[PDB]
Amino acid sequence: DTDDEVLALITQRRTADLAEFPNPPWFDNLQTWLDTQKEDGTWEDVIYLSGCDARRANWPIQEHWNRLITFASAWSGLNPAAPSNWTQDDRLLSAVLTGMDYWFENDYTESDCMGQGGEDEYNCPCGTPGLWNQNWYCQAILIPQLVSHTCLLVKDADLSEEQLAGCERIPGRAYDLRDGDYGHGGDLTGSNAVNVMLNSVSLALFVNNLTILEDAYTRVMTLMNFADEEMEDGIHRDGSFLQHDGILYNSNYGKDFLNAFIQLERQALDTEFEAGDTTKQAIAAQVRGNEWMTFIDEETRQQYWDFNAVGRFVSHPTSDLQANSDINYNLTKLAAATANFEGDNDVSDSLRRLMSNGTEKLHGNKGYWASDFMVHRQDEFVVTNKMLSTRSATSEYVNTANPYAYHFGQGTLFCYVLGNEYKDIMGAWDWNLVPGTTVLLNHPELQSSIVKFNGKKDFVGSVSDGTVGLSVEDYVDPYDGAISYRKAWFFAGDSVVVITTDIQVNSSATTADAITVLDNRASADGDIVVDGKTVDASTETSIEGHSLIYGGNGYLAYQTPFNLTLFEGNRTGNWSAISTSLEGETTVSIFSAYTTLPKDSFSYAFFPAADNKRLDQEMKSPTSTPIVQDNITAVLSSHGLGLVFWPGSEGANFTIKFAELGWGKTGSMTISSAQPGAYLLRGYNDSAKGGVRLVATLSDPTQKATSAGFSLVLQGAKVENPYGYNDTGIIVSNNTFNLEVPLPTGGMAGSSTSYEVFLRPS
Ligand SMILES: *[C@@H]1O[C@H](CO)[C@@H](O)[C@H](O)[C@H]1NC(C)=O
Ligand SMILES: *[C@@H]1O[C@H](CO)[C@@H](O)[C@H](O)[C@H]1NC(C)=O
Ligand SMILES: *[C@@H]1O[C@H](CO)[C@@H](O)[C@H](O)[C@H]1NC(C)=O
Numbered sequence: 001d002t003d004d005e006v007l008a009l010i011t012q013r014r015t016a017d018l019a020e021f022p023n024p025p026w027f028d029n030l031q032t033w034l035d036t037q038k039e040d041g042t043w044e045d046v047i048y049l050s051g052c053d054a055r056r057a058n059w060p061i062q063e064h065w066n067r068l069i070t071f072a073s074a075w076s077g078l079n080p081a082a083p084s085n086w087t088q089d090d091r092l093l094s095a096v097l098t099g100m101d102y103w104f105e106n107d108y109t110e111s112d113c114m115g116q117g118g119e120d121e122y123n124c125p126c127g128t129p130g131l132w133n134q135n136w137y138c139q140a141i142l143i144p145q146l147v148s149h150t151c152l153l154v155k156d157a158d159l160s161e162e163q164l165a166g167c168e169r170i171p172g173r174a175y176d177l178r179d180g181d182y183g184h185g186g187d188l189t190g191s192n193a194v195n196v197m198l199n200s201v202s203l204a205l206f207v208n209n210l211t212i213l214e215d216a217y218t219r220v221m222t223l224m225n226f227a228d229e230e231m232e233d234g235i236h237r238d239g240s241f242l243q244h245d246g247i248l249y250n251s252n253y254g255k256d257f258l259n260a261f262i263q264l265e266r267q268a269l270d271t272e273f274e275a276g277d278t279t280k281q282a283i284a285a286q287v288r289g290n291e292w293m294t295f296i297d298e299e300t301r302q303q304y305w306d307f308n309a310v311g312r313f314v315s316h317p318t319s320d321l322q323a324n325s326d327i328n329y330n331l332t333k334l335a336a337a338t339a340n341f342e343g344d345n346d347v348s349d350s351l352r353r354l355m356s357n358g359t360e361k362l363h364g365n366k367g368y369w370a371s372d373f374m375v376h377r378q379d380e381f382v383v384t385n386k387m388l389s390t391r392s393a394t395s396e397y398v399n400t401a402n403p404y405a406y407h408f409g410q411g412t413l414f415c416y417v418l419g420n421e422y423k424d425i426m427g428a429w430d431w432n433l434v435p436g437t438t439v440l441l442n443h444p445e446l447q448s449s450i451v452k453f454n455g456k457k458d459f460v461g462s463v464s465d466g467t468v469g470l471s472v473e474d475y476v477d478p479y480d481g482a483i484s485y486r487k488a489w490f491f492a493g494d495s496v497v498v499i500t501t502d503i504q505v506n507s508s509a510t511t512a513d514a515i516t517v518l519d520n521r522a523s524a525d526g527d528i529v530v531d532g533k534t535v536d537a538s539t540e541t542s543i544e545g546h547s548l549i550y551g552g553n554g555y556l557a558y559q560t561p562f563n564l565t566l567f568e569g570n571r572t573g574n575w576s577a578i579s580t581s582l583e584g585e586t587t588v589s590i591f592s593a594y595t596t597l598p599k600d601s602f603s604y605a606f607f608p609a610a611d612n613k614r615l616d617q618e619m620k621s622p623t624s625t626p627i628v629q630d631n632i633t634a635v636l637s638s639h640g641l642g643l644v645f646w647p648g649s650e651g652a653n654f655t656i657k658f659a660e661l662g663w664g665k666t667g668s669m670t671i672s673s674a675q676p677g678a679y680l681l682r683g684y685n686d687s688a689k690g691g692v693r694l695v696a697t698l699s700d701p702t703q704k705a706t707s708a709g710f711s712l713v714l715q716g717a718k719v720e721n722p723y724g725y726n727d728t729g730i731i732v733s734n735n736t737f738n739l740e741v742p743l744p745t746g747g748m749a750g751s752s753t754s755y756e757v758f759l760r761p762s
């Protein structure tokens with residue numbers, strides 16, 4: 001056996017791995033499924049419709065292969081959940097062989113049944129004999145996958161020549177068409193190509209062909225490399241997985257990519273097929289990006305995906321076991337696949353925090369530039385925010401699922417303190433009140449035809465330094481332009497300052513009120529509190545106030561008070577009217593609050609996981625101060641200074657005294673930028689050197705500028721370079737510090753970069 005030892009090792013590993021396909025509950029029906037099998041291999045209670053009579057989606061004939069794979073898993077003795085007395089039992093082997101015979105004998109013969117099946121223009125019209133389906137997916141992926149599993153599980157049994165012919169024919173017909181046309185499928189890309197190559201890996205291990213294995217592994221590892229174009233589907237360098245033109249989708253498509261990588265990497269360890277360096281870098285990036293999208297159910301310890309990375313599955317309940325039901329990948333197998341990861345690729349800490357089941361939480365602030373996404377986490381809450389630019393989309397209406405998701409991705413603000421705030425409330429949900437979004441009330445009329453849209457502006461990004469974050473969104477309504485504004489979020493500590501400026505409402509199209517939705521969650525224990533007064537919102541009630549407290553979260557209004565519209569109680573919706581689900585109707589208790597906005601601008605602050613004492617201290621001593629001024633938005637807080645130069649602010653100035661920041665008793669600072677951009681200014685008081693250590697963070701939201709023009713003008717202070725390097729475009733004089741730096745390009749367009757200087761009170 002020359003060099004087939006690598007093939008045999010990979011075969012052993014994959015055969016032990018493919019034995020895990022059957023659900024552990026399926027092993028109970030071994031005796032029943034064996035006894036109720038007919039003499040021709042079929043079963044009575046299984047639907048064997050083929051051709052133009054079968055069900056296009058979820059072909060019921062696959063139950064046959066499910067039972068065959070269960071038999072084979074029990075027979076091989078590789079699945080630990082199977083009773084040991086069925087190991088090497090000839091009854092299961094004979095049953096599997098008879099089922100394989102039944103399927104192979106009724107295999108179709110016209111190649112046009114692969115994809116264009118049922119089309120009269122091609123050579124497989126309705127009535128052509130054979131086991132095929134009008135759905136191209138059945139002949140390309142599904143049936144080949146099941147066949148590959150069954151054949152690989154019984155590779156060592158004495159198989160007839162017809163059985164081997166079928167085991168090589170059924171997946172080979174799809175593998176031979178890899179660089180060709182699949183009829184309705186056309187060119188297979190991404191998930192379909194990965195599934196085809198995975199089934200081809202199974203086939204190559206069956207027929208003992210190393211060339212097919214080389215080709216399939218090369219193709220798969222190439223498909224999982226970095227995507228560096230705007231909206232380009234794939235793993236980006238920020239850690240986000242895009243699909244369907246900028247729709248964040250780390251929870252479904254990227255999930256399948258990561259599962260395929262886990263499988264292939266664990267199976268091909270220590271061979272000439274283990275992933276290279278580029279693939280491991282991309283996999284580490286995706287693993288880290290997934291961890292920041294994962295929150296915990298504090299009661300059940302089950303981990304989920306954030307509702308901004310789920311897309312159309314938000315309209316499905318968790319019982320349907322879709323992308324929104326779980327993370328849906330084995331953390332132990334992911335740890336085993338990424339053990340050999342070294343250097344900057346090491347993701348051992350991510351896996352440690354994931355498998356800890358909430359005992360180690362993720363602490364910091366992260367900003368995704370390629371998807372306009374930002375996450376702020378403590379050990380006490382998880383806050384997410386997706387924005388809408390020319391490089392992302394809202395949602396999508398696919399396969400009758402998700403028709404009222406127009407407002408998603410248009411400036412959402414989700415909060416996870418318990419882990420069940422938004423669990424399966426989408427049934428009775430009011431889809432016009434998406435938490436965080438600033439929309440016109442019940443505009444437009446939500447329906448299936450109005451769902452997916454791309455942003456119209458480019459100045460939508462985020463700046464962060466790992467601890468504090470500032471996201472910006474030059475927003476315009478994409479469906480009709482009935483509402484436009486500029487909104488920013490400042491993430492620092494347990495507080496989120498939200499400054500909505502430059503509110504525009506096209507009153508010719510509609511006259512609805514411009515509102516900002518604070519939250520739309522499930523009922524939590526406690527009472528609604530407005531200015532310290534309990535409010536009964538069993539019926540939809542309006543009220544004004546400066547503070548709102550419910551479910552452990554606080555909402556503080558600056559200057560102009562709120563104009564709230566509150567509701568708490570049962571709503572009713574139909575799961576089968578928003579998706580293909582069969583759950584029917586649902587009745588859940590929902591608390592929903594949204595304020596009516598003033599005409600020009602409105603600012604407020606959000607304090608998750610806070611109590612009355614924190615909010616009282618804050619209202620009596622605000623640690624933050626929103627500042628709106630001449631196309632510039634600024635946030636003065638104890639943790640630093642957020643600063644937004646919106647488009648049209650070339651040559652403006654923002655002047656702030658050192659005493660307002662807490663740096664020095666005297667002295668001011670005049671800030672000016674050459675081109676629009678987002679900036680962070682954090683100061684640290686140094687008593688030893690007698691001065692202030694300033695850290696300046698910057699980025700480009702448009703992802704189209706190559707250089708920056710940061711300029712500071714100090715009064716009563718002196719700038720001193722600590723490292724003494726002008727290598728970063730730093731111009732240090734007596735009292736002036738200009739920063740001309742090259743911005744990141746390619747896949748890093750829109751990422752942040754920080755620099756240091758030292759100030760001395762003159
Ligand atoms: C042997 O297999 C049969 C068939 O399902 C099962 O009823 C029986 O419990 C098994 N015995 C043991 C010891 O697992
Ligand atoms: C392996 O597959 C390739 C591609 O179909 C083929 O060219 C080659 O002859 C095969 N090798 C063997 C030993 O069957
Ligand atoms: C991973 O798979 C093993 C074996 O089937 C199982 O015991 C374990 O619970 C799985 N882990 C998760 C997180 O599902």
